[PDB]
Short mmCIF file of N, CA and C in Angstrom, two decimals:
data_model
loop_
_atom_site.label_atom_id
_atom_site.label_comp_id
_atom_site.label_asym_id
_atom_site.label_seq_id
_atom_site.Cartn_x
_atom_site.Cartn_y
_atom_site.Cartn_z
N UNK Z 469 39.88 18.87 9.46
CA UNK Z 469 39.83 18.02 8.48
C UNK Z 469 39.10 16.59 10.67
N UNK Z 470 39.99 16.42 11.19
CA UNK Z 470 40.20 15.66 12.23
C UNK Z 470 38.77 16.38 13.16
N UNK Z 471 38.48 17.83 13.57
CA UNK Z 471 38.11 18.21 14.33
C UNK Z 471 36.20 18.13 13.52
N UNK Z 472 36.22 17.69 12.23
CA UNK Z 472 35.14 17.87 11.49
C UNK Z 472 34.46 16.21 11.45
N UNK Z 473 35.69 15.49 11.59
CA UNK Z 473 35.41 13.75 11.32
C UNK Z 473 35.83 12.76 12.67
N UNK Z 474 35.65 14.27 14.54
CA UNK Z 474 36.11 13.50 14.82
C UNK Z 474 36.01 14.45 15.96
N UNK Z 475 35.79 13.33 17.47
CA UNK Z 475 35.15 14.82 18.64
C UNK Z 475 37.07 15.12 19.17
N UNK Z 476 36.64 16.74 19.61
CA UNK Z 476 37.75 17.60 20.10
C UNK Z 476 37.61 16.60 21.66
N UNK Z 477 39.09 17.16 21.96
CA UNK Z 477 39.46 17.08 23.27
C UNK Z 477 39.39 17.67 24.36
N UNK Z 478 39.03 18.76 23.86
CA UNK Z 478 37.73 20.01 24.95
C UNK Z 478 37.32 19.86 25.33
N UNK Z 479 35.96 19.21 24.01
CA UNK Z 479 34.69 18.84 24.80
C UNK Z 479 34.38 17.30 25.57
N UNK Z 480 35.68 16.55 25.11
CA UNK Z 480 35.57 15.28 25.85
C UNK Z 480 35.85 15.63 27.60
N UNK Z 481 37.30 16.51 27.93
CA UNK Z 481 37.63 16.61 29.13
C UNK Z 481 36.72 17.23 29.63
N UNK Z 482 36.03 19.05 29.04
CA UNK Z 482 35.20 19.27 29.64
C UNK Z 482 34.06 18.29 30.15
N UNK Z 483 33.27 17.60 29.76
CA UNK Z 483 32.21 16.78 30.41
C UNK Z 483 32.84 15.35 31.12
N UNK Z 484 34.30 14.69 31.10
CA UNK Z 484 34.93 14.43 31.59
C UNK Z 484 35.06 14.66 33.19
N UNK Z 485 35.53 15.69 33.74
CA UNK Z 485 35.83 15.45 34.42
C UNK Z 485 34.68 16.79 35.36
N UNK Z 486 33.71 17.25 34.42
CA UNK Z 486 32.63 18.70 34.96
C UNK Z 486 31.55 18.03 35.36
N UNK Z 487 31.26 16.94 34.52
CA UNK Z 487 29.73 16.20 33.97
C UNK Z 487 29.58 14.68 34.57
N UNK Z 488 30.84 13.86 34.40
CA UNK Z 488 30.15 12.58 34.25
C UNK Z 488 31.03 11.80 35.21
N UNK Z 489 31.90 12.18 36.03
CA UNK Z 489 32.65 11.22 37.66
C UNK Z 489 31.96 11.91 38.54
N UNK Z 490 31.60 13.72 38.54
CA UNK Z 490 30.57 14.29 39.36
C UNK Z 490 29.69 13.53 40.23
N UNK Z 491 28.76 12.83 39.06
CA UNK Z 491 27.44 12.37 39.32
C UNK Z 491 28.29 11.04 40.74
N UNK Z 492 28.97 9.95 40.07
CA UNK Z 492 29.16 8.86 40.68
C UNK Z 492 29.95 8.25 40.68
N UNK Z 493 30.84 7.01 41.01
CA UNK Z 493 32.21 6.61 41.28
C UNK Z 493 31.85 5.18 40.38
N UNK Z 494 31.84 4.40 41.51
CA UNK Z 494 32.19 3.05 41.15
C UNK Z 494 31.24 1.95 39.68
N UNK Z 495 30.60 2.44 39.62
CA UNK Z 495 29.69 2.43 38.57
C UNK Z 495 28.84 3.79 37.57
N UNK Z 496 29.18 5.15 38.19
CA UNK Z 496 28.08 5.62 37.21
C UNK Z 496 26.45 5.83 36.73
N UNK Z 497 26.47 5.44 38.30
CA UNK Z 497 25.37 5.09 38.33
C UNK Z 497 23.72 5.70 37.71
N UNK Z 498 23.28 6.96 38.06
CA UNK Z 498 22.09 7.49 38.06
C UNK Z 498 22.26 8.97 37.28
N UNK Z 499 21.46 9.85 37.49
CA UNK Z 499 21.70 11.09 36.39
C UNK Z 499 20.57 12.18 37.32
N UNK Z 500 19.72 12.14 38.10
CA UNK Z 500 18.56 12.69 38.99
C UNK Z 500 19.91 13.48 39.87
N UNK Z 501 20.92 13.13 40.25
CA UNK Z 501 22.10 13.78 41.25
C UNK Z 501 22.89 14.35 39.84
N UNK Z 502 21.77 15.87 39.48
CA UNK Z 502 22.52 16.67 38.75
C UNK Z 502 21.74 18.02 38.23
N UNK Z 503 22.53 19.25 37.86
CA UNK Z 503 22.17 19.97 37.07
C UNK Z 503 21.06 20.06 36.26
N UNK Z 504 20.51 21.08 35.21
CA UNK Z 504 19.71 21.52 34.60
C UNK Z 504 20.71 21.20 33.20
N UNK Z 505 22.34 20.81 33.60
CA UNK Z 505 23.11 21.04 31.95
C UNK Z 505 23.61 19.28 32.03
N UNK Z 506 22.64 18.70 32.25
CA UNK Z 506 22.45 16.98 32.02
C UNK Z 506 21.68 17.28 30.21
N UNK Z 507 20.75 18.43 30.05
CA UNK Z 507 19.91 18.48 28.62
C UNK Z 507 21.52 19.49 27.93
N UNK Z 508 22.70 19.35 28.12
CA UNK Z 508 23.44 20.11 27.46
C UNK Z 508 24.03 18.88 27.09
N UNK Z 509 24.60 18.01 28.48
CA UNK Z 509 25.06 16.91 27.81
C UNK Z 509 24.61 16.00 26.78
N UNK Z 510 23.14 15.70 26.51
CA UNK Z 510 22.04 14.93 25.95
C UNK Z 510 22.99 15.94 24.20
N UNK Z 511 23.02 17.02 24.18
CA UNK Z 511 22.90 18.15 23.12
C UNK Z 511 24.81 17.39 22.36
N UNK Z 512 24.83 17.23 23.37
CA UNK Z 512 26.60 16.75 23.05
C UNK Z 512 26.93 15.54 22.38
N UNK Z 513 25.62 14.37 23.27
CA UNK Z 513 25.16 13.45 22.57
C UNK Z 513 25.10 13.70 20.91
N UNK Z 514 24.01 14.27 20.86
CA UNK Z 514 23.46 14.45 19.70
C UNK Z 514 24.79 15.00 18.87
N UNK Z 515 25.74 15.94 19.26
CA UNK Z 515 26.79 16.32 18.04
C UNK Z 515 27.39 15.20 17.96
N UNK Z 516 28.37 14.76 18.91
CA UNK Z 516 29.32 13.49 19.09
C UNK Z 516 29.23 12.46 17.80
N UNK Z 517 27.75 11.24 18.33
CA UNK Z 517 26.96 10.30 17.76
C UNK Z 517 26.77 11.05 16.10
N UNK Z 518 26.54 12.29 16.06
CA UNK Z 518 26.18 12.65 14.65
C UNK Z 518 27.13 13.31 14.06
N UNK Z 519 28.48 13.44 14.25
CA UNK Z 519 29.37 13.71 13.31
C UNK Z 519 30.01 12.37 13.44
N UNK Z 520 30.79 11.05 14.22
CA UNK Z 520 30.70 10.46 14.34
C UNK Z 520 30.82 9.40 14.06
N UNK A 68 -46.33 -10.53 17.88
CA UNK A 68 -44.79 -10.01 17.34
C UNK A 68 -43.90 -10.29 15.98
N UNK A 69 -44.34 -11.37 14.96
CA UNK A 69 -44.37 -11.70 13.83
C UNK A 69 -45.04 -10.73 13.25
N UNK A 70 -45.98 -10.34 13.12
CA UNK A 70 -46.66 -8.98 12.54
C UNK A 70 -45.55 -8.14 12.63
N UNK A 71 -45.20 -8.15 13.71
CA UNK A 71 -44.60 -6.74 13.97
C UNK A 71 -43.24 -6.51 13.19
N UNK A 72 -42.64 -7.80 13.27
CA UNK A 72 -40.79 -7.44 12.47
C UNK A 72 -41.67 -7.74 11.24
N UNK A 73 -42.50 -8.39 10.55
CA UNK A 73 -42.64 -8.25 8.80
C UNK A 73 -43.21 -6.07 9.12
N UNK A 74 -43.86 -6.03 9.43
CA UNK A 74 -44.50 -4.22 9.53
C UNK A 74 -43.03 -3.84 9.67
N UNK A 75 -42.02 -3.91 10.40
CA UNK A 75 -40.78 -2.79 10.64
C UNK A 75 -39.97 -3.49 9.64
N UNK A 76 -39.43 -4.48 8.61
CA UNK A 76 -38.98 -5.12 7.53
C UNK A 76 -39.46 -3.95 6.41
N UNK A 77 -40.71 -4.30 6.35
CA UNK A 77 -41.64 -3.02 5.50
C UNK A 77 -41.15 -1.80 5.29
N UNK A 78 -41.73 -0.96 6.88
CA UNK A 78 -41.86 0.29 6.61
C UNK A 78 -39.92 0.59 6.62
N UNK A 79 -39.15 -0.09 7.06
CA UNK A 79 -37.99 0.32 6.70
C UNK A 79 -37.41 0.42 5.10
N UNK A 80 -38.35 -0.60 4.62
CA UNK A 80 -37.99 -0.95 2.83
C UNK A 80 -38.59 0.22 2.32
N UNK A 81 -39.27 1.11 2.87
CA UNK A 81 -40.40 1.75 2.67
C UNK A 81 -39.46 3.32 2.61
N UNK A 82 -38.67 3.07 3.58
CA UNK A 82 -37.94 4.42 4.08
C UNK A 82 -36.47 4.88 3.65
N UNK A 83 -36.29 5.97 3.65
CA UNK A 83 -34.74 6.18 2.83
C UNK A 83 -33.58 5.99 4.14
N UNK A 84 -33.80 6.68 5.07
CA UNK A 84 -32.95 6.77 6.01
C UNK A 84 -33.32 4.99 6.52
N UNK A 85 -33.77 4.11 6.29
CA UNK A 85 -33.46 3.28 7.37
C UNK A 85 -31.88 2.84 7.36
N UNK A 86 -31.61 2.20 8.66
CA UNK A 86 -30.62 1.56 9.09
C UNK A 86 -29.84 0.81 7.87
N UNK A 87 -28.58 0.65 7.57
CA UNK A 87 -27.85 0.01 6.71
C UNK A 87 -27.74 -1.49 7.34
N UNK A 88 -27.84 -1.94 8.61
CA UNK A 88 -27.53 -3.48 9.70
C UNK A 88 -28.79 -3.84 10.82
N UNK A 89 -28.96 -4.35 10.40
CA UNK A 89 -30.36 -4.78 11.92
C UNK A 89 -29.57 -4.89 12.97
N UNK A 90 -28.03 -4.24 13.68
CA UNK A 90 -27.41 -4.37 14.58
C UNK A 90 -27.59 -2.77 15.15
N UNK A 91 -27.69 -3.47 16.42
CA UNK A 91 -27.85 -2.41 17.46
C UNK A 91 -26.67 -1.63 17.54
N UNK A 92 -26.29 -0.33 18.29
CA UNK A 92 -25.59 -0.10 18.48
C UNK A 92 -24.23 -0.39 19.02
N UNK A 93 -22.43 -0.40 18.08
CA UNK A 93 -21.61 -1.06 18.28
C UNK A 93 -20.80 -0.23 18.99
N UNK A 94 -20.29 -0.37 19.71
CA UNK A 94 -19.31 0.42 21.14
C UNK A 94 -17.60 -0.29 21.02
N UNK A 95 -16.85 -1.09 20.54
CA UNK A 95 -16.37 -1.87 20.55
C UNK A 95 -15.05 -1.95 19.78
N UNK A 96 -15.36 -0.42 19.05
CA UNK A 96 -14.19 -0.27 17.73
C UNK A 96 -12.84 0.56 18.57
N UNK A 97 -13.32 1.47 20.17
CA UNK A 97 -12.40 2.01 21.17
C UNK A 97 -12.30 0.92 21.70
N UNK A 98 -12.01 -0.25 22.02
CA UNK A 98 -11.13 -0.75 22.61
C UNK A 98 -10.11 -1.64 21.67
N UNK A 99 -10.60 -1.65 20.45
CA UNK A 99 -9.93 -2.57 19.36
C UNK A 99 -8.54 -1.60 19.33
N UNK A 100 -8.97 -0.28 18.40
CA UNK A 100 -8.00 0.35 18.31
C UNK A 100 -7.36 0.77 19.94
N UNK A 101 -7.63 1.05 21.22
CA UNK A 101 -6.68 0.94 22.27
C UNK A 101 -5.64 -0.30 22.27
N UNK A 102 -6.02 -1.42 22.05
CA UNK A 102 -5.34 -2.45 22.44
C UNK A 102 -4.53 -2.89 21.32
N UNK A 103 -4.70 -2.26 20.13
CA UNK A 103 -3.83 -2.26 19.13
C UNK A 103 -2.61 -1.68 19.18
N UNK A 104 -3.21 -0.02 19.69
CA UNK A 104 -2.16 1.11 19.86
C UNK A 104 -0.91 0.48 21.03
N UNK A 105 -1.83 -0.34 21.91
CA UNK A 105 -0.93 -0.73 23.27
C UNK A 105 -0.20 -1.53 23.26
N UNK A 106 -0.48 -2.99 22.05
CA UNK A 106 0.54 -3.88 21.47
C UNK A 106 1.29 -3.62 20.55
N UNK A 107 1.39 -2.27 19.47
CA UNK A 107 2.47 -2.15 19.17
C UNK A 107 3.24 -1.70 19.73
N UNK A 108 2.89 -0.11 20.89
CA UNK A 108 4.06 0.11 21.94
C UNK A 108 4.48 -0.78 22.47
N UNK A 109 3.65 -2.19 22.48
CA UNK A 109 5.41 -3.06 24.22
C UNK A 109 5.38 -3.41 22.89
N UNK A 110 5.41 -4.11 21.52
CA UNK A 110 6.30 -4.18 21.11
C UNK A 110 7.56 -3.19 21.00
N UNK A 111 7.42 -2.54 20.51
CA UNK A 111 8.09 -1.64 20.18
C UNK A 111 9.34 -1.03 21.25
N UNK A 112 9.05 -1.10 22.33
CA UNK A 112 9.15 -0.46 24.01
C UNK A 112 9.85 -2.05 24.06
N UNK A 113 9.67 -3.58 24.13
CA UNK A 113 10.22 -4.55 23.83
C UNK A 113 11.56 -5.49 23.52
N UNK A 114 11.42 -4.06 21.91
CA UNK A 114 12.12 -4.36 21.12
C UNK A 114 13.72 -3.75 21.95
N UNK A 115 13.43 -2.66 22.60
CA UNK A 115 14.92 -1.77 22.72
C UNK A 115 15.45 -1.64 24.20
N UNK A 116 14.82 -3.43 24.48
CA UNK A 116 14.97 -3.56 25.89
C UNK A 116 16.46 -4.51 25.57
N UNK A 117 16.30 -5.45 24.33
CA UNK A 117 17.34 -6.24 23.50
C UNK A 117 18.35 -5.73 22.75
N UNK A 118 17.79 -4.71 22.35
CA UNK A 118 18.91 -3.97 21.40
C UNK A 118 19.33 -3.13 21.56
N UNK A 119 19.69 -2.38 23.07
CA UNK A 119 20.30 -1.77 23.56
C UNK A 119 21.36 -2.21 25.05
N UNK A 120 21.55 -3.47 24.43
CA UNK A 120 22.89 -3.98 26.00
C UNK A 120 23.63 -2.82 25.63
N UNK A 121 24.48 -2.81 25.08
CA UNK A 121 25.65 -2.07 24.97
C UNK A 121 26.27 -1.84 25.60
N UNK A 122 27.23 -2.94 25.55
CA UNK A 122 28.38 -2.93 26.48
C UNK A 122 29.29 -2.02 26.60
N UNK A 123 30.08 -1.53 25.88
CA UNK A 123 30.82 -0.50 25.68
C UNK A 123 31.13 -0.22 24.27
N UNK A 124 31.98 1.22 24.05
CA UNK A 124 31.74 1.74 23.07
C UNK A 124 33.02 2.77 22.67
N UNK A 125 33.60 2.66 21.95
CA UNK A 125 35.32 3.18 21.18
C UNK A 125 35.16 4.53 20.65
N UNK A 126 35.10 5.70 20.99
CA UNK A 126 34.92 6.87 20.82
C UNK A 126 36.76 7.77 20.09
N UNK A 127 36.48 7.88 19.17
CA UNK A 127 38.30 8.22 18.43
C UNK A 127 38.04 9.93 19.30
N UNK A 128 39.21 10.11 20.07
CA UNK A 128 39.93 11.17 20.59
C UNK A 128 40.79 12.31 20.08
N UNK A 129 40.24 12.95 19.86
CA UNK A 129 41.74 13.73 19.53
C UNK A 129 42.55 13.57 20.63
N UNK A 130 43.84 13.54 19.97
CA UNK A 130 45.43 13.14 21.15
C UNK A 130 45.46 12.21 21.83
N UNK A 131 44.58 10.85 21.89
CA UNK A 131 44.57 10.34 22.12
C UNK A 131 44.26 9.02 21.64
N UNK A 132 42.95 8.73 21.08
CA UNK A 132 43.15 7.33 19.64
C UNK A 132 44.07 7.83 18.75
N UNK A 133 43.90 8.66 18.54
CA UNK A 133 44.99 8.99 17.46
C UNK A 133 45.96 8.89 17.04
#
């Protein structure tokens, strides 16, 4: 149930530790400093908000 | 000049391919369409500057928020 009406901590951890904070710190300013997997992050967005 | 205007009206009456109006080539429907689309888009994207302040969010995450 919770895996279908909530996000998974592995999905969180992946981007939280590998994608987001690797960009920048104090504010997480912008996103040109990144690989193509930003597109995958966007896909993750379209999963997360469309399950929550 | 007066006679020619009369004659033109008369031959237009006699002909079938006569113009439905005495106006010349109208060419300002494109600009109207362009400004309409422009105002529409400018409103659509002056909305989401206000409707996406997005202070912060509260995502429920397994193991922590539950």
